[PDB]
Design a protein around this ligand. Structure first.
Ligand SMILES: O=C(c1ccco1)c1c[nH]c2ccccc12
Length: 267
């Protein structure tokens, strides 16, 4: 408040409003995110938004998650202080500009995504909204960072019957039954994401295509990549790969380091 210098609004949406900021104490770049208390669906613990509980559980030590540095409670909103990489661009914008990604780049991005989601999972947190817009690229370090835990939940082994993430990334068992388990629904969304990365667009727009589960490639994509995608997008949850199987898949071998990724691909 006196502790942060606010700059430009970065965006707004169902997550609230995110401003670029600086922490005055040491000039650290931050993102400052406000949600209205009324617009908060889900709470935990003092009563904080679930997002804060989930962020505190994943923000310890380092990872591929944008870390929560601090939060404040205002009379009708909560304010989250988050890390801000600089320069940064979300993976959606990045794909809009460059179109479908070279596989070497998608492999590096995808792997970093998988490490970040494993970390969330090891921490007891299910993100539930993995997609291009929720992934930030630190364009100098080539490091990807998960954002927006606002639809996430504690990880658990029983079935989830609520979902408020992105539909076109939701699995067919959610579409048909409003039931999914955490890991396998995450894996499906990783399949959409991987397809999006290598094709330049998500594979399915309509409930029907999701449920049909048939994947058509519109760009040239290697067979190993199409196979990994189709495995993530297995119609039966239990036919999907574990994170381990995904990272042991042949398309995933020999990943570039993040730094290499930036040098070759991001300049
Ligand atoms: O954390 C973020 C976020 C976006 C939506 C919900 O949380 C950020 C959105 N744009 C950003 C830019 C830099 C760091 C975080 C974010």
């Amino acid at each position: 408040e006196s502790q942060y210098q606010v700059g430009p609004l970065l965006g707004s949406g169902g997550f609230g409003s995110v401003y670029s900021g600086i922490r005055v104490s040491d000039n650290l770049p931050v993102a400052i995110k406000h949600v209205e208390k009324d617009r908060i669906s889900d709470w935990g613990e003092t009563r904080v938004p679930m997002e804060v509980v989930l962020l505190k559980k994943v923000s310890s030590g380092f990872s591929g998650v944008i870390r929560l540095l601090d939060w404040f409670e205002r009379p009708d909103s909560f304010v989250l202080i988050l890390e801000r990489p600089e320069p940064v661009q979300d993976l959606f914008d990045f794909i809009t500009e460059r179109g479908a990604l070279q596989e070497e780049l998608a492999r590096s991005f995808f792997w970093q995504v998988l490490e970040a989601v494993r970390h969330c999972h090891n921490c007891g947190v299910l993100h539930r909204d993995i997609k291009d817009e929720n992934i930030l690229i630190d364009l100098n370090r080539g490091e990807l960072k998960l954002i927006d835990f606002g639809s996430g939940a504690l990880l658990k082994d029983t079935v989830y019957t609520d979902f408020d993430g992105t539909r076109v990334y939701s699995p067919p068992e959610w579409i048909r039954y409003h039931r999914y388990h955490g890991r396998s629904a995450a894996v499906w969304s990783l399949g959409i994401l991987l397809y999006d990365m290598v094709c330049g667009d998500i594979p399915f727009e309509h409930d029907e295509e999701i449920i049909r589960g048939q994947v058509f490639f519109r760009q040239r994509v290697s067979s190993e990549c199409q196979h990994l995608i189709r495995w993530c997008l297995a119609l039966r949850p239990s036919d999907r790969p574990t994170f381990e199987e995904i990272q042991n898949h042949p398309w995933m071998q020999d990943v570039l380091l993040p730094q290499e990724t930036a040098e070759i691909h991001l300049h």
